[PDB]
Amino acid sequence: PPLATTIDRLRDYLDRVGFQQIYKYIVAVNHYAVTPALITRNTAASVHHFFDSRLGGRAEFALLQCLMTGRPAEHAALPDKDRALADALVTAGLLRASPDGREVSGADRQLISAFGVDLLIDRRIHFGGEVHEVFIGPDSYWMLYYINASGIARTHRAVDLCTGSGIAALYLSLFTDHVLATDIGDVPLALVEINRRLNRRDAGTMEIRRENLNDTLDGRERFDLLTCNPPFVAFPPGYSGTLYSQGTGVDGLGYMRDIVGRLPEVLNPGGSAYLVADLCGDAHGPHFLGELESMVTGHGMRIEAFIDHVLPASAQVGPISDFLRHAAGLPADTDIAADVQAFQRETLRADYYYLTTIRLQTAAQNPGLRMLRR
Template identity: 35%
Template sequence: MFGVAIDDQVCDQLRTAFLSADYHADGVLGLLGPTAHAALGRGELEPAARACADGGALGALVRLFLLNEPVPEAEVAAALRPLPLADAVRSGLLHTDGESVRAALDLRPYGDDQGSWWVLSDLDSDARGGPVPADHVLGVGHASLSLARATARRPVGALLDLGTGCGVQSLHASRHAEHVTATDLSGRALALASATFRLNQLDVELSRGEWFKPVAGRRFQQIVCNPPFVVGPPRVDYVYRDSGLSGDSASELVIRQLPEHLADGGVGQLLASWLHIKGQNWGERVASWLPAQGMDAWVVQRDVADPALYVGTWLRDAGVDPRSPEGREQAGRWLDWFAENQVEGIGFGFVTLRHTQTGPADIVCEDLRQAYDDPLGPETAGWLDRVAWLRQHSEDEDLLAARLTVPASVALEEISSPAEDGWSSLVRRLHRQDGPGWQHDLDDLAAALLAGCRGHLDLGDLLGLLAAAHGLPTDVLVMGALPAVRSLIRHGMLVPADWVVA
């Protein structure tokens, strides 16, 4: 089926062979060592080749699947036992090369902090030695890793992995979802994902079809989606990245249709791209795709690429040399489309949606292009909690009655310059030292208010004391302070006092 015929028996025997050889994430790291393992991650193969030269069965599997080297038949047969070599070739996993064997598919360990899986996908352009075919199934790439790190991980019932590809998001979902449904338009993708799930002994419901059609009428507690979000002319050169829709219409389609498939309180998270068009605000463009009622939405822009860089990046991703006649022809067509549509840049990031059933939509679009190391998933979960709390305290009197505190992870930074009477403050900035590292500039009044937020007094009482100390009308101070307080709560720089464990 679609060039892949990995049945249950092959999966069972392959799993036995891999476990026997320690072909898993920790086993590979142990064989290669940190230095060679890091080099392999950068695409530098020689340190890994040297490290696994005398590695027995595990070394043979690393050379076969991770280094894409020809390995003698006898070594492969021994490493795959009890799976017969002929069955591995017949299934489409391997192919013979004289008296040696090569991998016909990418099959690699992939893990998280709870354990390791094996992931099947197609060989990339480097391993193939040329451009990938139109039905190429991408492996564990930067986009899938980014979405996995940005996804909130909390126990849910039913989860939908829309456009599963090789199944990476479903693997992660299996840790916290009772039932996982994975869909894709590509039959080859579903065939490889099915083998991945069976190899890892996971029960995932698979369904083939376009966008949300396979799950029409169904609702889920969580939806994750890594769609074909590449923007440009309406064509499909590669199914893993191209939707056939014009511009950023693929991202728009998913964002518009996803809410109707969320259960009440359900959360959807996806990667998306959007156009930066001359004279338009990108945030307003994305916000226009969302309903006006019953939705929390957090749109995070992680990067903006200029059109020329964007085109060159995606050509190389598919194994097309931008300098070749084919590459120049594709680039020209792509850049002409951008110019005709007044595209000045292409934004990329994450969209988190939550179905709230009633009430006006709370849509926040913001840039998050600063560098940070923490995964975005915990921050996303925290953002949803904080927005839910703000929704419960949407009336001014409710917020004024709340007791708030500044978390220990938040610091106040001050920069001053020399002055005649000592130092003159230039910048006073609140900085979160965890998560995305949010920053907020403060004036003297805001700094004084936060100094008093220790969970002992209501916000209204603090503002009253502050107004009296500075000779200001309390209502004027309240009117100016509440929007800033809400923004600080969204970013986790102020939190309800009862959320902090003493």
């Protein structure tokens, strides 16, 4: 109950000072829907300069910067209404106080706006040097980009599987009054609870459920609209990843297979699913799309694949190895890169990675697979 009141007061503050408009102005309309990695350790100094020089350092924006970049604000310099909120946020662990109590600064949550929603995310993904516990990324944004929002009815039943911060569920909640959001991690489940309240939603229009993906998929509930950005990264045998990163199956795509295979049953006829994954492939395209011809022929589906980023597998060796080394606390003499290269070649057959959003529709009047590449 005190946390809920604190989040209500945070929403009041964000409304009072026009947070979403400020964020939107800073990042601009040609970046707002590209990626959440806009305000980061590398751009924070320029954000601070904007507040200082273009917004005049006004005290009403001091608490906002604590939330947005982690910048310290002197406690006595906060406006009276903001000061009590700051204290409540410190009590909730959503901001820090300095040891002498004379200032407030960032904790592990960063405030952004995405797709018209206000969102706390894990600050560690864009700042600092400790591994994050809640994922968000450009792939999250691109799977939402392709949803045709004008086709969503207020009565449509929607589900966001593997919800994380809640971003896709909260986006869907802009249009339909029936959204289910699922996860199994303690940390993302607590965060989507906060973000639901931060956007004036509650259990009356969006249910948050602790439930395994495959349990929701086997269930009897039927949906008109489904979104899922599942764990999809394949790591070599013997390496531990994280809950949000490591996909199941030999090639990391087991959860994608699980979802697609149940779509004819879990979607109402004519319903649509939107998935996103970084898919291994050869020069012609992602391997996974070949598995989907069985859903065109077997179920009369229309399947559209939007390839928005292409990288050679060699360009992912470092990022994968860095992530594995950081996540498990491994030392610097381990030849992780060779293990990743061998796995890409022998198991994944990955010459390239294709960041792909996939729309799948049942009972299609124009069934077929369509792959869009630039």
